[PDB]
Design a protein around this ligand. Structure first.
Ligand code: STL
Ligand code: STL
Lengths: 9, 234, 230, 9
């Protein structure tokens, strides 16, 4: 999920 | 951890400092609105705000303390609620209008442009009139928005979340007290503020249904991120 | 015009006296079967809810058209917090009636139903973690009736709501809670109403998709209550 | 509406 990746960056 | 140790004042300023910026829309004044182009404007805007929201959330005390899966779930649950309370808040000083962006300030007649959109405008305008009637303060605003993030999906899962929520309750009371409200006015107002969240939830659910029917009717292309925030809800 | 006169203790007694009766199901098991029971139970409860609304202090002061609007907005919310309250003593189960206690898996007898059950079960768990009180329950439910459709000197209903907040706080003080504990518990209680609104919106959609597919006949009352949301 | 009637009754 994009959000899951977005929450890390 | 470090979140539960914050004073009330430290809570307030942490949350004020975390505030996302007000973003512009792609509004093009050389051409008329269509259903398709007004929806494009709103969805394009929502997509850009989401990236700010995600970074806002990470700055809300105690939020990064949670697993990645827990952050995803909360944001997936509250994102539209959070977009909507911001809108209502920006629209406070514009009675009869909704300030989507500084270059996109719409009344309900403009809302009628999109099928099914005016009903949601009307709810958002009324909530805006509620903020105006209560003279909602920005400090209170940021508290409420944080409560939505931590609360909305909290029973679709624990103790640490509740700890932060209680801490935000202390913060609201402190603000009201510091503003000279009586002990009774304080509890009364705390209740009025929180009751707002039932209406924000309502409007989110309706907007979610409406957004969904735009997607299913190919009215407008949604970003992959938006499609995923939306899918979370079905 | 006189609900603003009540004492905290009188507000509680009033709300308690106003409580609707607890009804039994027709139950003696398919998707049609179960849907009939739930909706048929719902139709009957709705009739009793109207008598109850009318005994909520401040409500009869409102025009007929405003009472209709408030009940149309809040009805499933009120139905559900009732259900959740009843099921609080039965972890993992939903007490629709005393002769209809349904575990989580029985929610799968009907399509889409289990997702709604899970939310109802989690709210019930939350009432239980909070040790929710009957006196608190009836205030919460009265708050839903007056609040859910209220945003639609027009300041009277808000005074009644304040009086009910005063009542919740009275209850807590009485229970020996500190000031900081009253406030936090009051917040805790009210944030639940956001989850209850959500469950009602989801319940409404599911009920409406059931009307279309046609698994079971709904009462006229139910259809109009439903169509106020469509 | 039926609800109208219930309320009056
Ligand atoms: O700040 C905000 C930014 C964007 C929006 C968008 C709301 C919205 C509501 C719908 O029913 C459909 C839709 O496609 C969008 C709301 C607030
Ligand atoms: O499709 C449906 C979805 C939800 C429901 C809920 C029914 C119901 C009936 C009650 O007596 C109390 C209650 O809290 C809920 C019924 C049908």
């Amino acid at each position: 999920k994009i959000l899951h990746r977005l929450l890390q960056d | 951890s470090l979140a539960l140790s914050l004073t009330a004042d430290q809570m307030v300023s942490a949350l004020l400092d975390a505030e996302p910026p007000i973003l512009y829309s792609e509004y093009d004044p050389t051409r008329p609105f269509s259903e398709a182009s007004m929806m494009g404007l709103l969805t394009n805007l929502a997509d850009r705000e989401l990236v700010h929201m995600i970074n806002w959330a990470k700055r809300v005390p105690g939020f990064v303390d949670l697993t990645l899966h827990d952050q995803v779930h909360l944001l997936e649950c509250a994102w539209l609620e959070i977009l909507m309370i911001g809108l209502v808040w920006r629209s406070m000083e514009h009675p009869g209008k909704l300030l989507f962006a500084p270059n996109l300030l719409l009344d309900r007649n403009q809302g009628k442009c999109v099928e099914g959109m005016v009903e949601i405008f009307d709810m958002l305008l009324a909530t805006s009139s509620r903020f105006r009637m209560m003279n909602l303060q920005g400090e209170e605003f940021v508290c409420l928005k944080s409560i939505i993030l931590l609360n909305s999906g909290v029973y679709t899962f624990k103790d640490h979340i509740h700890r932060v929520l209680d801490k935000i309750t202390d913060t609201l009371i402190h603000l009201m007290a510091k503003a000279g409200l009586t002990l009774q006015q304080q509890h009364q107002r705390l209740a009025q503020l929180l009751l707002i969240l039932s209406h924000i939830r309502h409007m989110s659910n309706k907007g979610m249904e409406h957004l969904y029917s735009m997607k299913c009717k190919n009215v407008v292309p949604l970003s992959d991120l938006l499609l995923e925030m939306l899918d979370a809800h079905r």
